[PDB]
Amino acid sequence: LFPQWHLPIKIAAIIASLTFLYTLLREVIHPLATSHQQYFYKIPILVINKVLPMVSITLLALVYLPGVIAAIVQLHNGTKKFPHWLDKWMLTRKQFGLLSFFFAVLHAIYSLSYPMRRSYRYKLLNWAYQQVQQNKEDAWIEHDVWRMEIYVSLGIVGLAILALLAVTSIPSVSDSLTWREFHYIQSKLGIVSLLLGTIHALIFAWNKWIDIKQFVWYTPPTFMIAVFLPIVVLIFKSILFLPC
Amino acid sequence: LFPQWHLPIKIAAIIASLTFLYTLLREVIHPLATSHQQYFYKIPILVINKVLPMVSITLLALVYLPGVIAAIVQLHNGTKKFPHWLDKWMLTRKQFGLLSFFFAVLHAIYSLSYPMRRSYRYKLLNWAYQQVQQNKEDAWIEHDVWRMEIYVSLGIVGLAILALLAVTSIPSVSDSLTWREFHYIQSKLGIVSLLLGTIHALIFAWNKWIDIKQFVWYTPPTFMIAVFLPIVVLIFKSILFLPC
């Protein structure tokens, strides 16, 4: 029963379960323990929408990580076989690219549902009152608007490219293109979506790197762990692109 | 011309047309007749978005309703044939599962477009003014935020599971899995989406059951008729799951 989906799902469940407890600890448990604060309403959306993108971008990085390892070990020995653990990994690249897309659209829908919630309404009315209370016209903040317009726009075009990888995974559509075309989509356009995905997360952290309020006790913010693996994969893909 | 889609579409059109006139009567006709109020702007979205989910969740319940009837009539006679009306119904389960998904994504997009409308903007500005007018800081309501975060989160994961049922309906993808795998998705994961779909509607009616303002003249609110059939299907699936 689903022999080629056991390994990707177990890895997806481990990353999801480990990130969930990690994010739930920084956003709910830590405020509840010290300076008691409920914050229990953040679990259904504001916590799930921090597990889905990290699972989505990590599984996406695991698609091209073997492509980099397979190249350096080919040069490390000069010539021709792959270890068992690597060749088994190379086969499940199709499944990783699908789970990564399945969690990307969930992260997409959860994000588009932010202004729909009631918690967003009651915060708009409080901000509107607190602004009138202090006679502050023109609540506009220029550099903050720049941030939101960019990483939202990059996240959408980053998801559109993933949709091309997913639609070419249909066996009828997949068995309709020559290998040069299929390899052109899964590799050339595929790595672009990883690039737009990690920049979508870096621009989101405009200046949260230098801020110390992000670290609850000593743990880094959840986005620093998310973008760690894709950045490693991208720079090594660039090093290999140099004459070598 | 589409022989296997005549019966599902006629049933979908009957439920849609009957619910439309029923919802239009409670939301537009009743306020217009007594204590004249236009409310004509609610038709394009606020009325259509009450027909799509009821059509979506009813058609979804009609997928597993024969699976329950076929089991009780197998025990009612002890052994082996099905009546003509039932076996004809058993064949159109694939079409019902697709129309249910086609209206679920429409109900999804219509719902995500709520904060985009102008009627939502002009109500935010009125609420913000009426809050400043009465010097009420902290418009937050705890139990109302709990409601919105849950049923929105359940509706998204309930739609994601339907997407798995729809993607496995592609003939190239469908004719790529052994019967045990295909039956595992359409039945095990399929009934879960019905469970998450009806809870998505019950949590939406946090306390609207006891309220009498919902009943316009004597008709129940539209969600009570929607969740009626799925609740019947779910409890009978649970009764059959007991040793029997």
Partner: antibody, heavy 121, light 113 residues
Framework: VQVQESGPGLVKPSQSLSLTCTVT?????????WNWIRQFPGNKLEWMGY???????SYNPSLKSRISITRDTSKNQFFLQLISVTTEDTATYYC?????????????????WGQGTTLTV | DIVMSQSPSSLAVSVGEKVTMSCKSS????????????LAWYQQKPGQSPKLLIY???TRESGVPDRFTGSGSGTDFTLTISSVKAEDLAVYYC?????????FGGGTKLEIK
Amino acid sequence: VQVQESGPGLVKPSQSLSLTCTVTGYSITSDYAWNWIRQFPGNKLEWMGYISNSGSTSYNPSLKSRISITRDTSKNQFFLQLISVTTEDTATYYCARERNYDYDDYYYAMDYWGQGTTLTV
Amino acid sequence: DIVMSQSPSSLAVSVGEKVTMSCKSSQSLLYRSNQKNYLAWYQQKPGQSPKLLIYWASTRESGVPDRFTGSGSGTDFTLTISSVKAEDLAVYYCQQYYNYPRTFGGGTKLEIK
């Protein structure tokens, strides 16, 4: 940051005064709102008004009419004008800063205060 | 205007002894959005400017001795000193910044005995 109040010490009743809150070592427009607090001889504090780093002001409604808080960003100064002073207006006037409003956790606190100046009518 | 009311107007204590000061509020100072109580505690030494001790009713200001601990939520807040020292002789005010205008308490004068 070193702040210092100034202004007259003795004024006649039914007159108009003007205090100063020359701020040194920091810019009055970056990330701090400055408030004006006065302390009556009976050890009773009262918040008169504040001025945001964008020129937005908000005064105590009990004396909103006869009050005005201006600034001179060219030299990091503030000005508190009491258009019609009275016997009740004699007190010690401090100008204390506070971290400006934030959408996440608003209204932090009035952390740093000045040494204040005494005013007599 | 939120009316702040401190229970002990002036209470005496000896060096090295626990003491508590109450600050009864008019309405709740708790923003239900982010559940933080907006109330601060100041300390005015004889002939000095009031310095901040505790903001948000529980967090000490950077540079405040550990013996100052504030607690409470809603409308009843308390400032506790574990061991009163000689330099803790001052007037302690509680203010609220829940909204405008800010209002201070009557002040609690601490007299060392």
